[PDB]
Amino acid sequence: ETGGRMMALMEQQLERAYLSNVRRPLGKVPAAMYDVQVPHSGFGIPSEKSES
Amino acid sequence: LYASRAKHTRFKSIVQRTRRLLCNGASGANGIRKLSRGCGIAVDSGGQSMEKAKFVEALEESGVSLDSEDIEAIVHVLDRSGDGVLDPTDFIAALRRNLTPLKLTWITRVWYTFTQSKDGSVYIDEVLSSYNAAGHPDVVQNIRSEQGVRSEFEAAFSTTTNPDGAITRQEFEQYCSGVAALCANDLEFLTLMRGVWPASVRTPLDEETMRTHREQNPCNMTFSSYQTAAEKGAVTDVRTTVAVVDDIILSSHRPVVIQSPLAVRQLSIALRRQDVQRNFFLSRETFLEVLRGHRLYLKDPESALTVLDTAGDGSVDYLLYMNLLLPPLPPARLMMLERLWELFPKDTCGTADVIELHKRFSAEDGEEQDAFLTAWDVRQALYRRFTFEEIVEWHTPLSAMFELDNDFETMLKKRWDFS
Amino acid sequence: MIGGQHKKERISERLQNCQNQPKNRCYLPGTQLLTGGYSTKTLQGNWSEERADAGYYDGKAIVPTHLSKIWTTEYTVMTNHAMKRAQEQAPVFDQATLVDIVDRNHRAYPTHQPHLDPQLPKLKEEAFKTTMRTSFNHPQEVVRPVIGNTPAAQARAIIMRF
Amino acid sequence: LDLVRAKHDDALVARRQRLAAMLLREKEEHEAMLNNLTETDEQRRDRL
Amino acid sequence: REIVCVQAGQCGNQIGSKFWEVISDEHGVDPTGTYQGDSDLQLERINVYFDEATGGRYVPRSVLIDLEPGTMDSVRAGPYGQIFRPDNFIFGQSGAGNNWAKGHYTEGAELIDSVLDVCCKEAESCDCLQGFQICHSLGGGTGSGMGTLLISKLREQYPDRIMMTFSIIPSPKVSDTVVEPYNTTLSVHQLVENSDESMCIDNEALYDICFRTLKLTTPTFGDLNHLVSAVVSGVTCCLRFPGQLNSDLRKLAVNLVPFPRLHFFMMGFAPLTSRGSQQYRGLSVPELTQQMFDAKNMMQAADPRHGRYLTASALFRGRMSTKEVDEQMLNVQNKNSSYFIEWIPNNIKSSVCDIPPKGLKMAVTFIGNNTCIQEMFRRVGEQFTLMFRRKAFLHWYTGEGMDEMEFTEAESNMNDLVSEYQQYQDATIE
Amino acid sequence: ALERYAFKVDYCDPQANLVRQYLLLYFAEDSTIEMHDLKTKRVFLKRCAYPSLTPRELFIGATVGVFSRSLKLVDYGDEVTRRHFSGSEAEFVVFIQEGGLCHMGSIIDRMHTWELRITNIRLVDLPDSLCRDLGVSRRCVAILFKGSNAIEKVGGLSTEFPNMTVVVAEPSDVNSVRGAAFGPGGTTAVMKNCSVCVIKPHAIMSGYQGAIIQRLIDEGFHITALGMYSLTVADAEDFLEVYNGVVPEYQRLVEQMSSGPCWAVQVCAENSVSALRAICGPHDPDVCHVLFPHTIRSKYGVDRTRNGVHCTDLEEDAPLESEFFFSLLQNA
Ligand SMILES: Nc1nc2c(ncn2[C@@H]2O[C@H](COP(=O)(O)OP(=O)(O)O)[C@@H](O)[C@H]2O)c(=O)[nH]1
């Protein structure tokens, strides 16, 4: 028997604190432990320019 | 951990029931004042401590009965130290501010019509002379007489009730909260406040525009079984306009302003500067030009501004707009801010100087000092004077960063002085 | 439209005591639009064309249920990001236009749906135009290429126009 | 008669839209109240 | 892609009642027949097992047959019984007498034409017909004789379709009837010729599941028939819901049977665990795989450890990664490599379905083709040989009319089935 | 007590639109039931355990739910049951005067604890002739009821609630008040600034009605009207038009409201609709049991279809619902 929706939501809320759910989620890259900023053009060095 | 949120919801229901029960008894509009007198409150915003058993017996003799679980919820919400002692001014504040935004707007508007003293008090002679019982809607429809309402009001404010002779803001708000709980809805409260306190509106208008505005109010537009198609459509139009304005404000305008105190303060300055009568009214084009300069926009100005018109003449009430834009604070934090406000000298219209704010502040980092100096610029202030609402609006975005009231206590003690 | 209200019995039909099959509207008890022996909810027969109707309505409540959240397909999880954006806008009709759609009044052929054509108003303005009237009006009254979908190309073209 | 009936059904549908919007808003608001029902170690250290 | 069910005899009718309860629950059909479900996914494949009657109601595509109406009246009187179509109940006026020959030859031929008329009426109404599904016991009287008779008639009439049987067979540990070996031998002879795929269950294994795994204090036949109904409703799940790797009864047959006589399978269902224990262990694909291959979880008395797997199939229900499934099936095949037939490079088929059974996050049903099934048939053949040498009860069967030559033929065919299984167990690649 | 009850019941078939009759037997020694068909003389259901059914709920005019079917008890099918219910068929009237309106919920709860079945109820104002003859006040609540050993049981209200109840036992006075108090006529309901709360049939049979009314009184609301009405299927549909296409349980709500009689109250207060919505709680009892444990629907609700009470959601429809309950149903 399932105790409805609130119990299920709290049950899933108590789950993610497990280390397995943190470093091994389903079909996803594990979350970062610090903030990252994606540049406007993307990652990597821009190509260096030269005089015409 | 849902016990805490169950307790909070129970506290809200307790406040609701306490407000309804007190105002339905022998002393209708004076229930909250009688409760404050019974609890033993002698300072308007003092930090007097009162033990739980005396509080529950005070509520018992007032006329409200609580069992164990409501007592536990009240203790959990109010007792911020865990010492078994609490301050009843927080409960009285919770009873005081339980109103719709329009009621709070007009209650604030009436209060500033008076002449304030050196310490923020208002004399009893002025409030007795400024009452106009002839315009009471009870008298106009001819149910009761002028002498009866005059006598009951004089019994409300008399020398035995206030031996000193001065009324504070808190007492007037308690009385107005009492008289508001008897009215059916917003329109009845507006009619009563306009008729009784005549100085609130600055210019009169003919009965034709007033009756046309009264007939188009959302309260009167309501369905029935024997309606015709055109009047059903009229009700639909009014309700749709109200819903669209409310949801566009909440969804769009709040996220722009709520993220920083600087934006709230600058918007308040921009709105207040154009006011020349100091009655919280503006024209439509002025309102739209002010909002355009702060990256807030409307899709249809004619339909959107018909709900901010609480005067019936085509103006815009920006006090109501600011009340709807920003969320209300919990009563404990409001008590904290009023304890801060007590330490300022005041002029005849109820303002304090910005230098007083400057010498009582203590920041920690450079960014917050820069933001404070930019928002509270002496040049940008209206007439080197500031009001209490500006403090409330400035502190509202900071109060959204904390969940417990003890954190807000600690931040207030660190930033400010004394209170 | 929400809640049906155009598939139900009309007052004129009730007063005249109209039966079902002369107009073939399935509202009377015991009659239903059965495609392949089943309702349109089941994927049998001609469900795709019947779901393409202008007056079609699916009995889905706006307030969602728990088991809908629990039971999801992998394809739905893959394509749900576009669905949230795509559900923002949808055409709507009033009740008189829905009466016209159900009664199928103005149609060239039985399956012609002009209310779903996005170019209908310009067709209506364009109707009743003759070749000479367009081509023989009053004689007094009557760019460097840029290639690419890149926003820089659009910006350059707009700057040149300005 | 049919046209007048449609004129009433318009207002009925409008009421349905308003009710649906309100109910969806309330349902979304309730579910966000379960978000932070967790206890951190910092508060426990403070109590000790 | 719709299946037609036939339920025969007491055991078959009893298991069927629980099956139609489980199926009606999964698709949200009220016992009045009204749809009361809560997702569109339930409605969109309802045609697979139900026909639609006028209005709300749905009716289940099943034929009920029995020789004395006591059981049929009990099933019609049960809580979901009303859903069944009245014209679909066929019954006689006197019992099978626990005699195979009576059930096959005298009253069988009397009733059988009306059953074929109902089955044909149901089949020709379908837009495309998938296989038949039949539940019966082999140890009984009416179950054995008319089930195998009807199977033969349907195999004559629909040779291009699939033929599927679920069958309960007598154990020596707890017999209810003395003449079980004769009826079993004749029925296995009929099935090995007629059937495409036959599933076998021992009541002793269901008792051991209930007592050891579920720790039930007082299990009842309703529980055994619920376990069977669970596996029966699980095998067909890919027909009627979406998934990442669809499967079909024909795809099961093509991947499991290497040679046409080797079509007898073992059953299991994995997330069996007692209500006290459920708080202590979460569901996961390694856990399901470990229970799935544990002989504790298999519904026959023979144990896999005495034989080798020719082929097996696992159907997973739930949201899960394919990588974990593939590597688990590889790891099990590599670590226990002596128990897998070496001239087949990969013995396990996997399939994945998005929609689990209600109240379980995930589930798998396991079908296995293992040579250890020969011990069960051998045990039945031993008891037959003990009884036959002394003509122990034969006059009843001979009085119905059977020649003794049928008994020697049926024994020879079953003995040849045992020999065919035993030779592939004990063989080298060469 | 009894060893076996026997009633005959009617079941309204929605698919067929006929009314079918069955025979229901209840064995009290082990709490099992069994149903037979009168038209066919065939068995409908064996002896199966059914713990949700109790002997206290078995009385004439009651409604029970057996395997998702609503059965209405109609008539005694046996003479043992007829003899056991030889009494409990006389109808008496108990009034509540002006001083007792504050204690009316406790009065109704006390009546329910005494095994008394209420067959009608209304809040009325009587003509002066009956006012003088009977001895009641102008504004009063009239309760019509029946049960076993009724007069001896209701004598306790004279000492539990002093000077607020009047009991009527003479058949002539009962007939006069039945003609006068109930039936077509006027109503005391207001037409503005009001809200309507409806008590569902399942809560009526279970009997939490007095607790609901007394909670409403305790919170501070005013009751301006009250009555009991029976809703047909079309009436239930027209009552819940706005809930079509919005909530997933529309048809179940329709059949629940058409199952049996329902009580309808009117509440007047400050911001009445919002206050009543706040006191009743959210639509789903599951949310109530976690976040709003003090609400009415938490105590008296089990799912969305049977959440106990029903309250107005849109402030545009409060006079519409008040009119539909207190004029259209009452007058005609
Ligand atoms: N699993 C299970 N076995 C049953 C059930 N009913 C009877 N049996 C078994 O089946 C055998 C009796 O066969 P039966 O069905 O009476 O044969 P029939 O007389 O030809 O119908 C015995 O081994 C019983 O234990 C049931 O509901 N479930």
From TrEMBL, chain A:
Question: Taxonomically, which superkingdom?
Answer: Eukaryota
> Would you tell me the protein name for this molecule?
EFHB C-terminal EF-hand domain-containing protein
Task: State the species of origin.
Answer: Trypanosoma brucei brucei (strain 927/4 GUTat10.1)
What stretch of the parent protein is included here? 105 to 156 of 415
UniProtKB/TrEMBL annotation, chain B:
Q: Does the keyword Manganese apply?
A: no
Q: Which GO terms describe its molecular function?
A: calcium ion binding
Q: Does the keyword Repeat apply?
A: yes
Q: Which InterPro entries match?
A: Ca-bind (IPR051581), EF-hand-dom_pair (IPR011992), EF_Hand_1_Ca_BS (IPR018247), EF_hand_dom (IPR002048)
Q: Where is the EF-hand domain?
A: 66-101
Entry's Gene Ontology cellular component terms: axoneme; cytoplasm
Q: Where does the source fall among the domains of life?
A: Eukaryota
> Gene3D superfamilies given for it?
EF-hand
Its keywords, alphabetically, are: Calcium, Metal-binding, Repeat
What is the protein name given in its UniProt record? Answer: EF-hand domain-containing protein
Q: Which organism is it from?
A: Trypanosoma brucei brucei (strain 927/4 GUTat10.1)
UniProtKB/TrEMBL annotation, chain D:
Q: Which residues, by range, are in coiled-coil regions?
A: 20-48
Where in the cell does this protein reside?
Answer: Cell projection, Cilium
| Family stated for the protein in its record | Belongs to the CFAP53 family.
State the name under which the record lists this protein. Cilia- and flagella-associated protein 53
Relative to the complete UniProt sequence, the shown stretch is: 50 to 97 of 483
From TrEMBL, chain E:
In terms of superkingdom, the source organism counts as: Eukaryota
**Disulfides per UniProt:** 126-128
User: Taking the first listed entry, what is the main subcellular location of this protein, grouped into a coarse class?
Assistant: cytoplasm
* Protein family membership: Belongs to the tubulin family.
What residue stretches are annotated with the Tubulin/FtsZ GTPase domain?
46-243
What organism does the UniProt record list as the source?
Trypanosoma brucei brucei (strain 927/4 GUTat10.1)
Q: Which CDD domains match?
A: beta_tubulin
Keyword terms of this UniProt record = Cytoplasm, Cytoskeleton, GTP-binding, Magnesium, Metal-binding, Microtubule, Nucleotide-binding
Q: Where in the cell is it found?
A: Cytoplasm, Cytoskeleton
Q: Does the keyword Repeat apply?
A: no
Start and end of every Tubulin/FtsZ 2-layer sandwich domain?
Answer: 245-382
Choose any GO biological process term that the UniProt entry carries and state it: microtubule cytoskeleton organization
Quaternary context: Dimer of alpha and beta chains. A typical microtubule is a hollow water-filled tube with an outer diameter of 25 nm and an inner diameter of 15 nM. Alpha-beta heterodimers associate head-to-tail to form protofilaments running lengthwise along the microtubule wall with the beta-tubulin subunit facing the microtubule plus end conferring a structural polarity. Microtubules usually have 13 protofilaments but different protofilament numbers can be found in some organisms and specialized cells.
One GO molecular function term of this record is: metal ion binding
Q: What is this protein called?
A: Tubulin beta chain
